[PDB]
Design an enzyme around this catalytic site. Structure first.
Site, PDB file in Angstrom:
ATOM      1  N   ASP D 107      -4.518 -15.264   8.603  1.00  0.00           N
ATOM      2  CA  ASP D 107      -5.672 -15.515   7.776  1.00  0.00           C
ATOM      3  C   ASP D 107      -5.091 -16.468   6.494  1.00  0.00           C
ATOM      4  O   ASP D 107      -5.898 -16.744   5.813  1.00  0.00           O
ATOM      5  CB  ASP D 107      -6.353 -14.308   7.266  1.00  0.00           C
ATOM      6  CG  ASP D 107      -6.967 -13.485   8.140  1.00  0.00           C
ATOM      7  OD1 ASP D 107      -6.157 -12.505   8.800  1.00  0.00           O
ATOM      8  OD2 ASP D 107      -8.141 -13.488   8.457  1.00  0.00           O
TER       9      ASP D 107
HETATM   10  C1  LIG Z   1      -5.360  -3.348  11.190  1.00  0.00           C
HETATM   11  O1  LIG Z   1      -5.078  -2.037  10.422  1.00  0.00           O
HETATM   12  C2  LIG Z   1      -5.015  -1.893   8.957  1.00  0.00           C
HETATM   13  C3  LIG Z   1      -3.877  -0.940   8.552  1.00  0.00           C
HETATM   14  O2  LIG Z   1      -4.191   0.227   9.467  1.00  0.00           O
HETATM   15  C4  LIG Z   1      -4.054  -0.860   7.089  1.00  0.00           C
HETATM   16  N1  LIG Z   1      -4.859  -0.203   6.017  1.00  0.00           N
HETATM   17  C5  LIG Z   1      -5.885  -0.607   5.509  1.00  0.00           C
HETATM   18  N2  LIG Z   1      -6.594   0.199   4.867  1.00  0.00           N
HETATM   19  C6  LIG Z   1      -6.146   1.349   4.706  1.00  0.00           C
HETATM   20  C7  LIG Z   1      -6.540   3.003   4.465  1.00  0.00           C
HETATM   21  O3  LIG Z   1      -7.406   2.983   3.635  1.00  0.00           O
HETATM   22  N3  LIG Z   1      -5.500   3.802   4.758  1.00  0.00           N
HETATM   23  C8  LIG Z   1      -4.541   3.765   5.418  1.00  0.00           C
HETATM   24  N4  LIG Z   1      -3.767   4.608   5.927  1.00  0.00           N
HETATM   25  N5  LIG Z   1      -4.152   2.288   6.256  1.00  0.00           N
HETATM   26  C9  LIG Z   1      -4.922   1.215   5.794  1.00  0.00           C
HETATM   27  O4  LIG Z   1      -5.054  -1.602   6.854  1.00  0.00           O
HETATM   28  C10 LIG Z   1      -5.832  -1.502   8.304  1.00  0.00           C
HETATM   29  C11 LIG Z   1      -7.035  -2.530   8.905  1.00  0.00           C
HETATM   30  O5  LIG Z   1      -8.281  -2.754   7.590  1.00  0.00           O
HETATM   31  P1  LIG Z   1      -9.228  -3.897   7.973  1.00  0.00           P
HETATM   32  O6  LIG Z   1     -10.062  -3.588   9.019  1.00  0.00           O
HETATM   33  O7  LIG Z   1     -10.211  -4.222   6.837  1.00  0.00           O
HETATM   34  O8  LIG Z   1      -8.561  -5.347   8.391  1.00  0.00           O
HETATM   35  P2  LIG Z   1      -9.667  -6.844   8.580  1.00  0.00           P
HETATM   36  O9  LIG Z   1      -9.624  -6.477  10.090  1.00  0.00           O
HETATM   37  O10 LIG Z   1     -10.570  -6.479   7.794  1.00  0.00           O
HETATM   38  O11 LIG Z   1      -8.597  -8.255   8.439  1.00  0.00           O
HETATM   39  P3  LIG Z   1      -8.912  -9.901   7.718  1.00  0.00           P
HETATM   40  O12 LIG Z   1      -9.777 -10.918   8.617  1.00  0.00           O
HETATM   41  O13 LIG Z   1      -9.840  -9.780   6.408  1.00  0.00           O
HETATM   42  O14 LIG Z   1      -7.902 -10.591   7.218  1.00  0.00           O
END
Ligand SMILES: CO[C@@H]1[C@H](O)[C@H](n2cnc3c(=O)nc(N)[nH]c32)O[C@H]1COP(=O)(O)OP(=O)(O)OP(=O)(O)O
Ligand SMILES: [Mg+2]
Ligand SMILES: [Zn+2]
Ligand SMILES: [Zn+2]
Ligand SMILES: [Zn+2]
Ligand SMILES: [Zn+2]
Ligand SMILES: [Zn+2]
Ligand SMILES: [Zn+2]
Lengths: 49, 93, 67, 479, 44, 82, 115, 45, 87, 8, 576, 98, 257
Positions: D107
């Site tokens: 990204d």
């Molecule tokens: C892909 O997986 C990751 C990881 O698992 C890690 N992560 C994130 N939040 C948490 C949380 O609350 N708790 C725990 N344990 N882990 C967490 O974040 C996840 C994804 O999240 P997202 O779905 O928002 O990623 P976009 O698809 O959104 O990416 P864009 O295009 O913005 O760059």
């Protein structure tokens, strides 16, 4: 005298109520400021519904 | 299959189905400190004190808690110096 | 807050054109016609004048900190 | 029509009013995937712009104001009531959706360094520090004055030259990290002179003082607020997002010569990876680029109300065809390094990009032999306290899987809380030990000969002592 | 040690441990004046 | 145990290689004599790697069998996992 | 805070050599030139002029890292020709081309004005 | 209390939290800052 | 420092004997004073006992020259007038 | 968001 | 209370003993860097200056450490401290006497972190073993950690504000442990699934598909430039595939130089026709599929996710299994560099021109939707007349929903297939889907043809209002539009009711993500705690801490999971 | 003092009694951007506990059409538990039934 | 093995624009000339500002940035001026810099627009392209701005404030004949202004023997330098870079042998 009630900004009982934008500028308050918040202990607090 | 089989073997090793929970894991006769690290904590320690249990200190978590080198890999063995080989060879410095 | 000198993409001086743009808009020119008259041709330069928000007037409304 | 309902009792004023304040700034919301609209609603709260026109008067902690806010070239009709035109948050940027050098992968974003030099996405960060001269103490008075190393028994070796006579640094003086913004002194009761009570700048602030104010607060004591201003030129760590849920850091900054250039000489201010669009299905971004190109050439701000039925991609494309560009918005680009035409034609158009509050300078932390906590004698926590990062239980499990027993030992014992205790051999309970006297004795046994030194984490010593206070005896026996 | 006043913008010199009140207006919100030492700004 | 009836693997395990190289390098850093002639190698770890290739590291690995017995394999005797 | 100064891109710090010539052991008659504090501008011209030379078997330029400022130019020539000779001759040819271009651009300017 | 410097004023440090002899740089006290850590109303309660 | 360095090979858990608690505690006669401060700062036989541990980051506890680092702390005992069940 | 068998 | 302190998380037992805050650790935002190798990580200069690794003074290194001591803390390659034999620490920042600066054997100089210093790199959550890998340090002049793009897949990290933790080992012993156990090249293949963890990703995968097409021909100078970025090049230019009329190399010819050593592998491209293997032209493939590598040379085939991705039998997996970890690291890095420099010549983009399809295709999609709506109406009319017969084991409501969903799903898939037919070769959505870099056929279908049915809790959009989904629809409307079917594509734009239903579906997706994180964390922790102490003893029995025999041999065959490969027995299936 | 304390602390009740106090009310206004200020002022907070992972209170409901923004919700542990009013929505102030 | 002999035709020459066609040249040379236009033509611009009083709404660093971006006439003096690093004198002297001074106070009720005309230079040659005006800041009554600034010689590689050009247009092969860009649909693409094809044919037939030549330029100036002078200075500066390379290369070659 039985106490003091905090006043939400730009409500009817606030000083800014019914003031022209020029007057708000004279008080160094923004015309575009929405209001709706209390200034308690110098910090603006918002009551989430 | 190795990773699935290992979990299945640990759960059914004792002869009774050992759930991966506080109950099943803590009921097995491991060291009291190792049980303490998982869930129950203080209650496990109190019971161990009451019954005079001794921690063998063979577990990984128990050694990690006391700051000692773990019995895990790179700690399973103990290196010893070889005097005869030290004498042999070219000792430049 | 104020019209940027030197349009970001190319670097043509666009800071001298804000008051002329406003005056042409007062003269009932359309925004595109005013941009054409000012000499802004590439869409990068036209973005600067068309999308500018002049907040410095709103800031000048407030009385000075020191007179 | 063909009869569906002939008994309508009410009618909607406009379907776009179902959206809220933050979702109303999204152009062409109906052309995006729903999670992406949800994500933009959150990112728009964190964007940088002039928050309020009276920001000069206000003394707020953590206030960011962009140098050159611009109103969107593609705007929703409901934005007018949100006053987004009056106080915009973001700059229209010539954005190319291309893979240039691999630094826009994932990204991340390749930005134009020359544009950054010309004011693009430049902001100011104001931080206000408040201090109160409290005389409430019976014999303690927190007077405002410039502390002197000789006069004050308690002092620090950071720079105190900046402070004036009042103990408050004058506006217009540069302040680097670990400098004294406010000098305060507590008079010390002479139980039988001065414990320093100055306030120090947050590390790496590196700003210039903007305003210094002296008043009386609600309690009537003297109150001083000092506002420090730091300009923030965009870097290769700063986070930029569009209005369609596409967030990313700045991978690298190339100068105008290095950036790819159209035949007209237009070089993209921002290059975003083409791989972001398909999985996320943010077609509203593409339609916004097309409408922005049309709007910039025509001279009229484009309309992006969610549900219009009068604005279609085909109509926008024909309008763009009138202005001399390819109807789908693609443009033939030339490679900046070599000058050769790129074989694929890159999609270039103006798009409203925002600058989020998250910046690398605020998020960079390094710790090496810093201060330790009182209770655990372990490293502190947090960037402000120079705290070390936590080596969690999942991390230790990964290290166990590695078989790196000695790295695990260093990280969990030697780096954090090394400690030594003396333990009686006869009874596992710890024994009193005077190293300077060289006499080591154990109470309860009346035994001095049998004592052994044991190295354990201080947290483990604390655990064993807390077990002892609960009448549990953790008798650690070396045998 | 010259404090500019918020209300009437008149500089008033205030000694140490002296009440923070502007003569000729009575306002209690003072601003310290810009320092005499000069800072070099790169136009960059 | 006796030198005869060694049941452990003749190959040096990865963990043994890691710990032997690290320990020998720490010794070399503390000015221990180096068996292998160094060709302008100043980093202790690289000299340890050269010694391991030449099988001249003066360390004997004591492998603890789960029954409590131990088998002492010299570094030379063990086949390098590489 | 860790941003390099802008002048670092084109200014040689003290003790830095503009050109360092290191031979390539892999292939005969090949030298690897390292130019410090230079960018694609000089590298592309030099590589192109080298490629025009019939005796140059290989010529390419590489910026090892965009954040750092360095050009690595590999030149391989036929036997009876030296890579260093090819580099010098390429620079002379580029200088001649630029000088001729300057003369003709000045003539074009003078003709366009008042003519 | 620098051992080689009788009656030497040791400068406090914030980076590592130690008092250091300024003329030789010796660290006297390793990590001896740690964190370093209403009496008016009533009394001890 | 003269004591040899040893690594714990077995941790024995047991309930602390009241007699062992009496012998082990540095405080003698129990904590007789609820107040923590006597003579200004230190209260002998009080909650903040100089013998029990190092105070103020510069003092030395009575039992050993801890200097806030060497001393691991020393336990004290309170002799309850009537016995109380342990929860 | 696709179908009943897919994803939401 | 004492029990309160010990019992809870962040208590002494777990929050201060099992895990704890550590020194010599640093954290900052991560950003991409294609030029760095797989093992290298880019560390900012300030982070490098604060962190110090103590070096023992030896007769070999006394001069270098003396120069570092003279430089001091201010100059970057300097030393923050000197540790004497007595244990006395001389902080060089405050003025040290010139006598103190002198070094003798046994002193420990704490130099600033320099290029080539091994560190451990972590990204929370640390789900698996590959989430902590040892990286070599390269100091670069900005304030973000910079790691290679291939290493993103093990960490599950993208550069949209992510952050990572940097731990510097402080001893030669632990440094050697990391170097020989946890380095990135050593953990290319996971023991979990006996597949490579890391694969070519994003621009490099998309561009390797285009580079390896039969069409791609490279002229002499372009070949020069591409070979310049190949680190393992022999210095010998390959003989061009087309000598006359003009010397022109092929993309496969240059990629063959990247392939390590002599690796033999046969894989199939994603678009491989099923009938091709049986029919003629099986070996001379008409579509240039069926990747074949013989003697480390790409004879034929178009590379894609299957050949260069994280799957068993991939070219990277065969490289690790055959050539070794070091040559495989060089393989990853060289693919990235050479293909990324060719992508400057070729380029990639995504525009609206990709989303738009032919008018005939749009009419076909519309006709499919018309007839699908008619079919759903017919099913509804059958249900109202009670002519519908219940499916065994299902109520009439359930069977009506089943039939309606089948009709709508068939229409949705058919419209998607029509849209996918419309895609040209030049279409970039198709480039990314075919290469496998990002996206899917479903995403293309939703972009171009039909977003599809919006389902919440496994059913069509429920009747939130009394017997109707929204106030605009009539009561007891089981039709396609009312219950959530989004006929319009993303490009066409959703109608307002479809917008709300789409928002409902997306909300269900977000909620599922949020719930799954927590539940999976708890499960993972419990499994680890139950099996933490189990290990392979020198008897090669798998025993726990109590020494109870879990398994007599590990995996019942005493082999590790990374070395094994999928194979066919070939004696089992055939007839007698 | 009662009104000021309940506003400043964010606990709805008396200083002495926190058992029945409800936290999360009266947050500090966000001033990062004018959009953030406006959205913070127009915000709804569902009382359901964040710790509970039951998904029924979080899902978007059909009855939220035009009253609550469908897109604007925090992503994380509070998905669907914090909501923002739509543009035209107006909460009733109240009146006597006489 | 020798350099091609290039030719130049100047189609348009105005006060702010030069259009020329370079023929019989390699693509690398032409692109490098284009690059030198942007980043290696020296110009004088403000780089040092000491602000004595700034009562304006814009903060001090804002004013400094805007002052830096203001173009200054550097037609002939830039060759005479030396880089501040080259000059022997400490800090800045008339040989290595130009001093600009600005003093404006608003005493009228009407808003005072501080423009580039209020910048006053000690050297007559360097003036802020005034002979409307660039708006530095707007001042309310009772607001004052007084500052002193020095201008240094530099090129656009350091900062974009030293970029002589507004937009450099570079185009070769106007009708795609070398097929350097492969149009998916040739007909949709607009024809180039330099295209010689008839309306019916979208692309020229492929020419395998052809190589890029006859490069088209369009150089626009900010007023800092004459648009002709930008091109001439760029050619001269690239020649100087190559000559410096040759000197250092000769030193290395002789030293090694
Ligand atoms: C892909 O997986 C990751 C990881 O698992 C890690 N992560 C994130 N939040 C948490 C949380 O609350 N708790 C725990 N344990 N882990 C967490 O974040 C996840 C994804 O999240 P997202 O779905 O928002 O990623 P976009 O698809 O959104 O990416 P864009 O295009 O913005 O760059
Ligand atoms: Mg991410
Ligand atoms: Zn422009
Ligand atoms: Zn004892
Ligand atoms: Zn006043
Ligand atoms: Zn000393
Ligand atoms: Zn003690
Ligand atoms: Zn001078």
């Amino acid at each position: 005298f039985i106490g003091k009630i905090p006043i939400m900004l730009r409500s009817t009982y606030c000083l800014l109520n019914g003031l022209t934008d020029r007057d708000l500028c004279e008080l160094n308050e923004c015309p575009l400021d929405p209001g709706g918040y209390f200034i308690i202990n110098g910090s603006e607090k918002v009551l989430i519904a | 299959y190795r990773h699935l089989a290992l979990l299945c073997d640990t759960m059914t090793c004792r002869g009774h189905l050992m759930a991966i929970t506080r109950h099943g894991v803590n009921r097995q006769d491991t060291g009291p400190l190792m049980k303490c690290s998982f869930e129950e904590t203080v209650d496990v320690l109190m019971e161990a004190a009451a019954h005079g249990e001794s921690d063998p200190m063979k577990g990984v978590s128990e050694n990690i808690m006391l700051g000692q080198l773990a019995p895990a890999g790179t700690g399973c063995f103990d290196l010893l110096l070889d005097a005869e080989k030290c004498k042999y060879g070219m000792e430049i410095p | 807050m104020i019209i940027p000198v030197r349009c970001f993409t190319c670097g043509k001086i666009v800071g001298n054109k804000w008051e002329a743009y406003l005056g042409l808009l007062q003269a009932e020119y359309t925004e595109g016609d005013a941009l054409d008259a000012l000499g802004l041709k590439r869409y990068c330069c036209r973005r600067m004048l068309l999308a500018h928000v002049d907040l410095i007037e709103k800031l000048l409304n407030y009385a000075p900190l020191e007179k | 029509e063909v009869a569906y309902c002939s008994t309508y009792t009410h009618c909607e004023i406009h379907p776009s009013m179902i959206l809220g304040v933050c979702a109303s700034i999204i152009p062409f919301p109906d052309h995006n995937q729903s999670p992406r609209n949800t994500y933009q609603s959150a990112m728009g709260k964190q964007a940088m712009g002039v928050y309020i026109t009276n920001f000069h008067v206000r003394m707020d902690t953590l206030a960011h104001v962009l140098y050159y806010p611009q109103k969107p070239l593609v705007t929703t009709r409901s934005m007018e009531y949100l006053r987004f035109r009056e106080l915009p948050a973001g700059i229209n940027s010539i954005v190319a959706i291309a893979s240039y050098t691999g630094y826009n992968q994932e990204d991340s974003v390749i930005m134009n360094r020359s544009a950054v030099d010309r004011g693009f996405f430049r902001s100011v960060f104001y931080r206000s520090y408040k201090e109160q001269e409290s005389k409430k103490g019976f014999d303690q008075e927190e007077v405002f004055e410039k502390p002197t190393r000789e006069t004050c028994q308690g002092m620090r070796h950071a720079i105190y030259d900046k402070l004036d006579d009042d103990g408050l640094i004058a506006p217009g003086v540069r302040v680097s990290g670990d400098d004294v913004i406010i000098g305060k002194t507590v008079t010390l009761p002479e139980n039988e002179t001065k414990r320093d009570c100055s306030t120090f700048l947050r590390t790496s602030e590196t700003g210039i003082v903007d305003q210094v104010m002296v008043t009386l607060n609600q309690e009537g004591y003297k109150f001083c607020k000092i506002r420090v201003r730091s300009v923030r030129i965009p870097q290769i760590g700063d986070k930029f997002a569009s209005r369609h849920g596409q967030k990313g850091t700045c991978g690298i900054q190339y100068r105008q010569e290095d950036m790819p250039f159209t035949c007209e000489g237009i070089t993209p201010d921002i290059i975003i990876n083409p791989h972001a669009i398909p999985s996320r299905m943010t077609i509203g971004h593409l339609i916004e680029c097309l409408q922005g190109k049309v709007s910039a050439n025509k001279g009229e701000i484009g309309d992006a109300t969610p549900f219009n039925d009068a604005v279609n991609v085909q109509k926008i494309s024909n309008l763009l065809s009138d202005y001399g560009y390819h109807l789908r918005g693609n443009e033939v680009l030339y490679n900046g390094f070599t000058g050769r035409k790129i074989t694929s034609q890159i999609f270039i158009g103006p798009t409203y990009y925002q600058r989020l509050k998250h910046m690398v300078d605020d998020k960079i932390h390094s710790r090496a032999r810093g201060p330790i906590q009182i209770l655990n004698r372990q490293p502190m926590e947090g960037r402000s306290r120079d705290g070390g990062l936590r080596f969690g239980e999942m991390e230790r499990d990964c290290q166990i899987a590695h078989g790196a027993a000695q790295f695990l030992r260093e990280r969990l014992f030697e780096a954090s809380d090394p400690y030594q205790v003396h333990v009686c051999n006869l009874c596992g309970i710890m024994a009193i030990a005077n190293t300077r006297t060289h006499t080591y004795e154990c109470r309860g046994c009346r035994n001095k000969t049998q004592i052994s030194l044991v190295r354990m984490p201080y947290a483990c010593k604390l655990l064993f002592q807390e077990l002892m206070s609960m009448s549990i005896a953790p008798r650690m026996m070396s045998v | 040690m010259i404090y500019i006043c918020g209300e009437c913008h008149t500089e008033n010199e205030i000694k140490s441990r002296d009440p923070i009140r502007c003569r000729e207006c009575g306002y209690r919100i003072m601003y310290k004046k810009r320092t005499k030492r000069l800072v070099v700004f790169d136009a960059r | 145990q006796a030198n005869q009836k060694r049941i452990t693997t003749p190959y040096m395990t990865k963990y043994e290689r890691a710990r032997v190289l690290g320990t020998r390098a720490l010794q070399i850093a503390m000015c221990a004599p180096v068996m292998v002639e160094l060709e302008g190698e100043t980093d202790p770890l690289l000299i340890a790697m050269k010694e391991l290739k030449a099988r001249k590291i003066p360390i004997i690995i004591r492998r603890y069998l789960p029954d409590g017995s131990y088998e002492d394999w010299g570094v030379d005797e063990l086949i390098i996992s590489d | 805070m860790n941003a390099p100064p802008a002048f670092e891109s084109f200014l040689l710090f003290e003790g830095e050599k503009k050109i360092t010539i290191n031979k390539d052991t892999k292939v005969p008659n090949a030298c690897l030139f390292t130019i410090n504090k230079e960018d694609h501008t000089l590298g592309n011209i030099i590589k192109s002029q080298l490629l025009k030379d019939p005796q140059v078997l290989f010529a390419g330029y590489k910026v090892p890292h965009p954040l750092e400022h360095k050009i690595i130019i590999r030149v391989q020539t036929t036997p009876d020709y030296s890579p260093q000779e090819a580099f010098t001759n390429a620079i002379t040819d580029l200088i001649s081309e630029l000088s001729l271009l300057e003369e003709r651009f000045r003539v074009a300017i003078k003709d366009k004005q008042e003519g | 209390t620098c051992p080689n410097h009788p009656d030497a004023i040791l400068v406090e440090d914030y980076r590592a939290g130690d008092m250091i002899c300024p003329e030789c740089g010796l660290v006297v006290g390793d990590r001896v800052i740690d964190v370093g850590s209403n009496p008016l109303l009533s009394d001890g309660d | 420092s003269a004591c040899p360095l040893r690594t714990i090979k077995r941790v024995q858990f047991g309930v602390l004997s009241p007699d062992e608690l009496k012998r082990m505690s540095v405080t003698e006669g129990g904590i007789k004073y609820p107040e923590t401060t006597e003579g200004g700062r230190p209260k002998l036989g009080g909650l903040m006992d100089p013998r029990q541990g190092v105070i103020e980051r510069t003092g030395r506890c009575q039992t050993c020259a801890g200097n806030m680092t060497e001393c691991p702390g020393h336990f004290g005992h309170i002799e309850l007038a009537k016995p109380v069940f342990h929860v | 968001i696709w179908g009943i068998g897919c994803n939401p | 209370s004492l029990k309160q302190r010990l019992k809870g998380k962040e208590g002494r037992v777990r929050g201060n003993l099992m895990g704890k805050r550590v020194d010599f650790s640093a954290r900052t935002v991560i950003t991409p860097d294609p030029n760095l190798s797989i093992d290298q990580v880019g560390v900012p200069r300030s982070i490098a200056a604060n962190m110090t690794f103590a070096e023992i003074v030896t007769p070999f290194n006394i001069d270098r450490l003396q120069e570092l001591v003279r430089r001091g803390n201010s100059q970057y390659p300097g030393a923050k401290y000197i540790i004497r034999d007595n244990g006395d620490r001389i902080d060089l920042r405050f003025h040290p006497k010139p006598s103190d600066l002198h070094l003798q054997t046994g002193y420990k100089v704490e130099r600033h972190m320099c290029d080539g210093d091994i560190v451990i790199f972590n990204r929370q959550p640390t789900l698996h073993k590959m989430s902590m890998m040892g990286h070599r340090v390269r100091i670069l002049p900005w304030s973000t950690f910079r790691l290679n793009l291939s290493v993103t897949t093990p960490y599950n990290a993208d550069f949209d504000g992510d952050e990572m933790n940097l731990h510097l080992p402080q001893s030669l012993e632990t440094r050697a442990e990391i170097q020989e156990l946890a380095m990135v090249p050593r953990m290319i293949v996971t023991p979990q699934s006996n597949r490579p963890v890391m694969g070519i990703v994003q621009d490099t995968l998309t561009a390797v598909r285009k580079f390896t097409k039969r069409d791609v021909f490279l002229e002499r100078g372009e070949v020069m430039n591409l070979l310049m970025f190949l680190s393992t090049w022999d210095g010998k230019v390959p003989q061009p595939a087309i000598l006359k009329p003009r010397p022109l190399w092929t993309g496969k010819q240059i990629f063959s130089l990247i392939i390590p050593g002599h690796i033999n592998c046969i894989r199939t491209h994603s678009t491989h026709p099923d009938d091709e293997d049986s029919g003629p032209y099986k070996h001379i493939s008409p579509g240039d599929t069926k990747v074949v590598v013989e003697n480390g040379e790409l004879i034929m085939g178009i590379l894609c996710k299957k050949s260069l991705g994280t799957s068993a039998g991939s070219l990277v997996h065969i490289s690790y299994l055959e050539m070794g970890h070091d040559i495989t690291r060089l393989f990853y890095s060289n693919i990235q560099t050479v293909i990324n420099n060719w992508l400057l010549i070729e380029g990639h983009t995504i525009g609206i021109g990709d989303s738009i399809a032919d008018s005939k295709t749009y009419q076909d999609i519309q006709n499919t939707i018309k007839k699908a709506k008619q079919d759903v109406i017919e099913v509804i009319e059958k249900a109202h007349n009670n002519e519908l017969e219940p499916t065994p084991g299902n109520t009439l409501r359930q069977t009506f929903e089943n039939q309606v969903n089948r009709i709508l799903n068939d229409a949705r898939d058919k419209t998607g297939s029509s849209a996918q037919k419309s895609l040209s070769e030049y279409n970039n959505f198709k480039s990314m889907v075919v290469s496998g870099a990002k996206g899917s056929k479903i995403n293309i279908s939703q972009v171009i043809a039909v977003v599809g049915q919006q389902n919440v809790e496994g059913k069509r959009i429920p009747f939130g209002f009394k017997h109707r989904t929204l106030p605009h629809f009539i009561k007891d409307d089981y039709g396609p539009e009312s219950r959530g079917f989004v006929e319009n594509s993303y490009l066409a734009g959703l109608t307002p009711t479809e917008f709300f239903f789409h928002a409902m579906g997306g909300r269900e997706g977000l909620i599922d993500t949020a719930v799954k994180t927590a539940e999976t964390g708890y499960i993972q922790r419990r499994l680890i705690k139950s099996m933490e102490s189990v290990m392979v003893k020198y008897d090669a029995t798998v025993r726990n801490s109590i020494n109870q025999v879990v398994q007599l041999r590990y995996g019942e065959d005493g082999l590790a999971g990374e070395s094994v490969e999928f194979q066919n027995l070939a004696t089992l299936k055939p007839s007698n | 003092d009662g009104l000021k304390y309940s506003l400043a602390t964010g606990n709805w009740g008396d200083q002495k009694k926190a058992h029945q106090a409800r936290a999360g009310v009266s947050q500090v206004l966000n001033r990062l951007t004018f959009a953030s200020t406006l959205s913070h002022l127009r915000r709804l907070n569902s009382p359901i506990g964040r710790d509970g992972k039951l998904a029924k209170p979080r899902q978007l409901h059909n009855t939220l059409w035009g009253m609550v923004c469908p897109a604007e919700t925090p992503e994380g542990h509070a998905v669907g538990l914090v909501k923002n009013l739509a543009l035209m929505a107006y909460i009733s102030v109240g009146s006597q039934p006489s | 093995p020798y350099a091609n002999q290039p030719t130049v035709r100047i189609t348009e020459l105005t006060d702010e624009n030069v259009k020329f066609i370079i023929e019989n040249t390699d693509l690398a040379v032409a692109n490098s000339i284009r690059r030198v236009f942007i980043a290696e033509v020296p110009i004088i611009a403000i780089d040092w500002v000491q602000i004595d009083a700034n009562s304006s709404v814009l903060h001090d660093e804002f004013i400094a940035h805007r002052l830096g971006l203001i173009p200054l006439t550097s037609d002939d003096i830039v060759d005479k001026l030396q880089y501040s690093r080259d000059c022997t004198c400490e800090e800045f002297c008339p040989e290595c810099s130009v001093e600009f001074t600005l003093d404006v106070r608003c005493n009228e009720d009407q808003t005072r627009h501080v423009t580039s005309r209020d910048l006053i230079s000690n050297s007559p040659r360097v003036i802020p392209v005034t002979s409307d005006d660039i708006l530095i800041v707007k001042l309310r009554k009772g607001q004052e701005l007084r500052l002193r600034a020095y201008a240094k010689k530099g090129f656009g590689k350091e900062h974009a404030k030293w970029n002589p050009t507004a937009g450099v247009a570079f185009e070769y092969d106007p009708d795609n004949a070398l097929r350097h860009t492969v149009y998916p649909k040739p007909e949709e693409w607009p024809k180039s202004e330099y295209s010689e094809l008839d309306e019916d044919e979208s692309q020229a037939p492929y020419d395998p023997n052809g190589k890029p030549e006859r490069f088209y330029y369009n150089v626009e100036s900010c007023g800092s330098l004459r648009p002709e002078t930008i091109v001439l200075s760029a050619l001269s500066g690239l020649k100087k870079k190559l000559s410096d390379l040759q000197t250092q290369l000769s030193h290395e070659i002789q030293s090694d042998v």
